Amino acid sequence: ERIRALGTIEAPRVTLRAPFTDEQFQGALYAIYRHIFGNTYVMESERPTTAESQLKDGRITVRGFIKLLAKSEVYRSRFFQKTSQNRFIELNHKLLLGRAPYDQAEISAHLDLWNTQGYDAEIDSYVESEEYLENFGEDVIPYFRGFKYQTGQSAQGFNRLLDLYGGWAGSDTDRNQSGQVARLTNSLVRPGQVVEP
């Protein structure tokens, strides 16, 4: 409770297996849309009905649906098109993987990968990674797992996720007066020190 994220930890994990009837699916959609889009408001016009139909039929798993949403126009228009690449990498980590970035090597690698292979490859590097399949796998909606100690994490990852979280109410709009600027530009490359120009 001294950390903001009391309720997020208490939040149940959600799973969607093949013979899901109705309300398991309806709850899964709300959980996915709440987490992936960073608690941002998603109007009924923007909701992808075809991806939901594919998920309901079972052609794509929950992970494939997450990948499609990450490649959707809402994800781009909010996190990619309006922010620098640092903020995009941080948002990708926080949403698709549930953890903050651990070091600067991640930013360098992901920025080079984007510049060389495109947004689709950039996103696939997240979902198809071994880390996502370990923690979540095909059938589990991603959750904020950085608040507990994650095997192999850096000392700073918990603090960085605290910086990214901003309460259960707060969200990663890009509708702010600031314009969705990055949060961890100096924390990642200079972890401990503080400087004044």
Ligand X SMILES: CCC1=C(C)/C(=C/C2=NC(=C\c3[nH]c(/C=C4\NC(=O)[C@H](C)[C@H]4CC)c(C)c3CCC(=O)O)/C(CCC(=O)O)=C2C)NC1=O
Q: CB 10 → ligand X: shortest distance, Å?
A: 19
Closer residue to another protein in complex, CB, 31/95: 31
CB 94 within 8 A of CB 180: no
What is the distance in angstroms between the CA of the first residue and the CA of the last residue of the chain? Answer: 35
- Contacts to ligand X from residues 155-194, by CB under 6 A: none
Whichever of 86 and 156 has its CB closer to ligand X, that residue is: 86
Query: Which of 74, 122 has the CB closer to ligand X?
Result: 122
Neighbours of 171 (CB within 10 A): 17
56 binds ligand X (CB under 6 A): yes
Which one-letter amino acid corresponds to residue 107?
I
Give the binding range for ligand X (CB under 6 A) out of 11-19, 37-45, 54-62, 173-181.
Answer: 54-62
Q: Select 26 or 168, whichever has its Cβ closest to ligand X.
A: 26
The entry of another protein, ligand X, none near residue 119 (CB within 5 to 8 angstroms by kind) is another protein
Tell me which residue of 125, 119, 159, 126 sits closest to 142, measured CA to CA: 126
Whether 14 contacts 141, CB under 8 Å = yes
The answer to whether 180 and 80 are in contact (CB under 8 A) is no
Stretch that binds ligand X, among 19-27, 82-90, 141-149, 165-173 (CB under 6 A): 82-90
> Cα 45–125–49 angle (5° rounding)?
20
Give the binding-site size for ligand X (rule: CB under 6 A). Answer: 11
111 binds ligand X (CB under 6 A): yes
Please name the residue ranges forming H helices in 37-182.
49-57, 62-70, 73-75, 85-92, 104-117, 119-127, 130-135, 157-165
Options 14-22, 47-55, 120-128, 146-154: segment touching ligand X (CB under 6 A) = 47-55
Q: Give the binding site for ligand X (CB under 6 A).
A: 50, 53-54, 56-57, 84-86, 107-108, 111
